[PDB]
Amino acid sequence: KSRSSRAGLQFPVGRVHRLLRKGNYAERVGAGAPVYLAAVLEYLTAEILELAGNAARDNKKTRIIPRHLQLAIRNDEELNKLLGRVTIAQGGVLPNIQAVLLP
Amino acid sequence: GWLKEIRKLQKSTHLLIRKLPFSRLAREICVKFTRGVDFNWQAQALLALQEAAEAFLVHLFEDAYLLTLHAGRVTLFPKDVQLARRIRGLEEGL
Amino acid sequence: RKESYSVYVYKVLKQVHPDTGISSKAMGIMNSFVNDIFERIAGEASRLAHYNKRSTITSREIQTAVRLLLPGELAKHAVSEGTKAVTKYTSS
Amino acid sequence: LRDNIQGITKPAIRRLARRGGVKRISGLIYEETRGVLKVFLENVIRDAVTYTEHAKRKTVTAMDVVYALKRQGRTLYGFG
């Protein structure tokens, strides 16, 4: 009888509703706004986790580390444009060397 | 000749692009985004859009000429504008 | 006595990759990402509601904020998922 | 010319470059400037049309342009 189960989701709906109600955003909150927000958040999380898992599997690993998250984020133009001013700790850089330097 | 032109243009504050071509271009770009419906436009909206666009272009030209002077030339090239857009970092140069 | 999104991220990971684990630092990074996106979307929806002289945040404001914030294909797929979840939730 | 993008003539681009402080320009600059202006206009107009059609209106208002410019990180003071 859960709301997240009623909407077919894994993310919580009541928690997002409470955070919206106690976040100083508006005097009133509707009924479908937390469902919409939880669905969008779960979709984004699933995309990022799938890309990171593919990176870790191609890197011959079994566990995801921040390096895999960095590799997944910086190799997708839309995700890179979304997180354009974010720094990931212990993530490193992409192996990009200028072609003029290499023989 | 060019020196007097620059010195006179840097003192004025009026718009440099005509109104009718800008209006036509903006209207066609706006109708390209919707589903075929035609939207009306206020005059102040088009004026504000033109002001913002011209300010952006002048600032970008200043940055590109800084890059041109760094490269050791006096003539502006498209690669200077491209490098300025790249250094500005995905949010200011685009 | 602290709150996070660890269990839900783990459930999503088990749905996507059934034989893959995750460290603690990556989980902290995921929590930070979720909080950041939540804050952005909620702030944009609040601004939208204030511009049009309204005192309610509905799914329409959330949809418009998602369209304003995310790039093209991400926005399209997010809107699709959101409306799908809404129409599945209102039919129960 | 006939195409609407060709309405931005070379004298106007030359005047903008001269106001910017440029002394000597090349021939390939005008098409690049047209493309950059087109991208800028596309972004701003998309945001403004979204703001306009969120409300149930059919006319683009200067406040929509101001809000789009502000949310993109560029504040305009004159038309507030």
């Binding site: 444009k81 | 491209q82 857009r85 | - | -």
Partner: peptide, 21 residues
């Protein structure tokens, strides 16, 4: 260059500072 669970093509950010015809 990659199709995820949903059929969204995930592309690499090749180039964005050059004007393309």
């Amino acid at each position: 260059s990659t199709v995820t669970k949903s059929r969204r093509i995930s592309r690499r950010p090749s180039d964005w500072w050059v004007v393309k015809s």
